[PDB]
Design a binder for this molecule. Structure first.
Ligand SMILES: Cc1cc2c(cc1C)N(C[C@H](O)[C@H](O)[C@H](O)COP(=O)(O)OP(=O)(O)OC[C@H]1O[C@@H](n3cnc4c(N)ncnc43)[C@H](O)[C@@H]1O)c1[nH]c(=O)[nH]c(=O)c1N2
Ligand code: NA
Length: 489
């Protein structure tokens, strides 16, 4: 009867039963992790692909009426696949927002409305079409969905200049657990605060986000400078941890470290001419010179930073043919105090070259991201943060998991004394189920279980998130294994 309920309001075109011949390709289209696409993963009973907001409301009403929970999917990047799989057998539908990819840019007001189903590449491209001197601070990977990226916070190469995506959202269109359509005004301050950074799923289905668009110069400068240990990587990184978080807001230098080399990748909101003396003055250890400069427009920096590409702009931002589906494991940490130089020695000399070693990505904070009060948004990793670490393990055959998974665990153990503690902070969008998962009692996720992983992602904000959840979704309709549990008065 679920199908009959849906088809009353939604075209058959947009309803994919699990038995449907079209269902496997719709399911797989935006799966980004080969661990979660294989037949042993728990599959949704139905996938619904709305093209307008009433289809979302209808699906929710139908879901409530027929006791079918919904997991919403935008770009499909969830590290645990929680947008399209459950961990244990469960009946659920996926509401897959991929056909709702509209981006309307008001270049004059410097605001834009973007559907959650858009990918970052489509958002970024539409901004560029409106103006060569406007930008929006979200993720690095162009295939990330707006929905998940904004709901969990969202950060990238502009985080030092403008903070996270979520703190630059000025309104939303959202469907709640009752199928009611909300904006900022009708949902109220608590719900609007929660939705912008408090994690995907928990607070309802965001249909579209209104954002403020921010200035960038017509030319930005990117560099990618690699250092092995004999070229000085240990001393350069030992300096970087102090220097990079204190650099002017216009300069962000992230690190990608894999095997024998650390690649220092910078985006500077300016020219080589001003970048050169700044580097020689503030970060001379890197040996940056004008030859390392790549001047281009902001929009051009997106494929450049992520892929190294210089002339497939539309392909890199706009292509929706997946084709990158590693088996992948991810973890993250936040660092508040400088590592001893000997820890960098262990990381670069032993950890990164062990069997199963992954990639370590280091993003420096400070400036704007750290200026924002910790409780101002649900994202708490702000004042005092030196840098974020992401531990990324890829493998490419189903039987090759043992070594990377073991390295991932062992390194997280090794790093424990040097990273944040009590709670050990982690970024919500770097979803890591090993941080803890919910217990469900009487069909409702418990506060006590949610608190364990919840304080890691959201620290002191977890409480306001759970109280908000209690008000907007007391029966815990919109949930997953690591979603905000209701705390009800
Ligand atoms: C290649 C690549 C690169 C990166 C990243 C991922 C990947 C795959 N990440 C992490 C990314 O931000 C995280 O996986 C997001 O939650 C993904 O959002 P999607 O919509 O793509 O995923 P997906 O559709 O799987 O959703 C993720 C979670 O949000 C919920 N959700 C999705 N749409 C929603 C909606 N409309 N309303 C409410 N909830 C919704 C889902 O139910 C799920 O729980 C990231 N992050 C980052 O900040 N900066 C970065 O540079 C990167 N880099
Ligand atoms: Na994982």
């Amino acid at each position: 009867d679920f199908l009959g309920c849906l088809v009353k309001e939604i075209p058959p075109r947009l309803l994919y039963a699990k038995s449907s011949p079209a269902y496997p390709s719709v399911l797989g289209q935006t799966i980004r992790n080969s661990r979660w696409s294989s037949p042993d993963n728990v599959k949704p009973l139905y996938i619904i692909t709305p093209t307008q907001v009433s289809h979302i409301q209808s699906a929710v009403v139908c879901g409530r009426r027929h006791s079918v929970r919904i997991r919403v999917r935008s770009g499909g990047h969830d590290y645990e696949g929680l947008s399209y799989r459950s961990l244990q057998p469960e009946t659920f539908a996926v509401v897959d927002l991929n056909k709702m990819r509209a981006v309307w840019v008001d270049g004059k007001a410097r605001t834009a409305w973007v559907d959650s189903g858009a990918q970052l590449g489509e958002l970024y491209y539409a901004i560029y079409k409106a103006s060569p001197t406007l930008a929006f601070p979200a993720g690095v990977c162009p295939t990330i969905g707006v929905g998940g990226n904004f709901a969990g916070g969202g950060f990238g190469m502009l985080l030092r200049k403008y903070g996270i995506a979520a703190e630059n959202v000025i309104d939303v269109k959202l469907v709640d657990a009752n199928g009611k359509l909300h904006d900022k005004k009708s949902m109220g301050d608590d719900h609007f605060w929660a939705v912008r950074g408090g994690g995907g799923e928990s607070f309802g289905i965001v249909v579209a986000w209104q954002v403020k668009l921010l200035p960038v110069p017509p030319t930005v400068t990117i560099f990618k400078i690699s250092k092995t240990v004999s070229e000085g990587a240990v001393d350069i990184i030992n300096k970087w941890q102090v220097v990079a978080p204190q650099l002017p807001a216009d300069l962000m230098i992230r690190i990608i470290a894999q095997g024998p080399k650390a690649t220092f990748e910078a985006m500077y909101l300016g020219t080589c001419k001003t970048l050169t003396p700044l580097m020689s003055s503030k970060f001379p250890e890197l040996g940056m010179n004008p030859s390392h400069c790549n001047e281009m427009s902001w929009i051009q920096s997106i494929p450049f930073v992520h892929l190294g590409h210089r002339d497939a702009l539309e392909d890199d931002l706009l292509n929706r043919q997946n084709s990158f589906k590693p088996f992948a494991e991810y973890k993250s940490d936040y660092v508040y105090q400088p590592f001893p130089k000997t820890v960098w020695e262990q990381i670069l000399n032993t950890w990164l070259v062990k069997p199963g070693a992954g990639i370590m990505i280091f993003d420096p904070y400070g400036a704007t991201i750290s200026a924002t009060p910790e409780s101002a948004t649900p994202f708490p990793h702000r004042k005092g943060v030196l840098f974020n670490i992401q531990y990324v393990n890829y493998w490419f055959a189903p039987g090759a998991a043992a070594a990377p998974l073991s390295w991932s665990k062992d390194i997280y153990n090794y790093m424990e004394p040097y990273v944040s503690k009590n709670p050990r902070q982690a970024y919500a969008n770097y979803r890591d189920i090993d941080l803890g998962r919910n217990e469900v009692v009487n069909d409702v996720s418990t506060y006590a279980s949610g608190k364990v992983w919840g304080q890691k992602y959201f620290k002191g904000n977890f409480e306001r998130l759970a109280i908000t959840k209690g008000k907007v979704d007391p029966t815990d309709y919109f949930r997953n294994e690591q979603s905000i549990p209701p705390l009800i008065k």
